[PDB]
Amino acid sequence: SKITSSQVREHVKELLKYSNETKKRNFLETVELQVGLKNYDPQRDKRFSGSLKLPNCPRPNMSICIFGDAFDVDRAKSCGVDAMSVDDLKKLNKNKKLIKKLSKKYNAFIASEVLIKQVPRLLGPQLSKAGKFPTPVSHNDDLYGKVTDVRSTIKFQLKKVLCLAVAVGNVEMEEDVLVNQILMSVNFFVSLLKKNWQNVGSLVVKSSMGPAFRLY
Amino acid sequence: AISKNLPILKNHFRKHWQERVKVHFDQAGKKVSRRNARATRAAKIAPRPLDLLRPVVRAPTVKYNRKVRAGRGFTLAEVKAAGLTAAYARTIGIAVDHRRQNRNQEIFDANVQRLKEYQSKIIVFPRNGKAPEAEQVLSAAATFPIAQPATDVEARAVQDNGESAFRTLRLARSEKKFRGIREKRAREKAEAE
């Protein structure tokens, strides 16, 4: 690893110093990692995609919708998470303006194993175009646990642009937790990346309403 | 090929070894001609003793440094301490080695003493006149034998003070083994602010 833990600790220290004390903001500020990869071609090279689950959640309150069956909706009443049924999805009747409104409403979607087949048939491909596609859930697993999991998901997918960005966590967390999460995210990124630590163009740490800080 | 319980042999006879076979049939005749050559050389140098005087000198390696033997020639420092030049010593029959040095005072003193006895024992003739004939001996090495120095006396008093001579060897080996790591730790301790 070219990046060192003490340098991460230092840069996190002035980042939290700027975010917390000097210029506090009313909205909670998310810490962002913005990466750019180098000597890489989206068209020819394999398009890497991967996901990791952070231990402490970056975004506790981000909106999630659960497409679900009878059992999934009944459990979702206990979870307190917004849900529309298969009958509701049929009532939508593939109307583009309303489903675009739903896609801009909800950042994340969780769907059942049974209904994940016809989620494209009822809804179409505009979810894949946006990049928000429902994540599978089963009857055995806990919905609120997987809501916490999806809220803690970090995903790197190549697409077409050679620069990516993820949300490591909040400003308000503790410094060692922030250091550990940014280190494991960089390690996950270089694990997905071929010819690791040399196709890394630039790594940037930032806070929401904050200046950029360059880690190599 | 390989057979009964026998040791593995290594006989290097796969070349044309019968082209190079030297059988020393001429051992006896070669010895006779060698004695003839020695006698005619002695008759040719009829007063001189057939060989130069060699210094006593300490044998090199740790296997053989317990012994002392004959060298090639005397040091220039040794012949200057004996009180004669190197050219004159070479003319009167003393082997001089310009390329060995004196680091040992006992060897230096032994060689100086040996040169003193040689200068006492020889007769040098005048270059022009009478030549007072003097019945040569044939071996300066036999007239000046190389003697091993007496290192100790055969009976002493026991001087014991409790170190067992095994702990001493073991501790010396250990401090040689862990020398350089100790100055490494000392250097980093010194540069620790």
């Binding site: - | 040095q101 004196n102 040992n104 010396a172 080996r173 040689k176």
Partner: protein, 99 residues
Amino acid sequence: TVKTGIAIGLNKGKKVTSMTPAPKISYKKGAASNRTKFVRSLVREIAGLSPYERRLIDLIRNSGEKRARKVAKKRLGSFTRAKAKVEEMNNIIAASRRH
């Protein structure tokens, strides 16, 4: 540098009284004389610089002594000769700057 008297250790060997013999003149073969120093300085003034020495002068001026030593190690044989060559070229730069 005296011996210890025992067969192993740091200064193993028998203690004998030393003599410290007279120094040989062949041990000073590489010593520089005044006359050869004068000759070398004069012919350096007359002949100037070789092309690799000129591009080394440019490498100390631009890219620093590390790249200069790397190029001189590639050009000459060994790192020792490269270090000595870069040192004397830095001396030429200082002398020409004084000129």
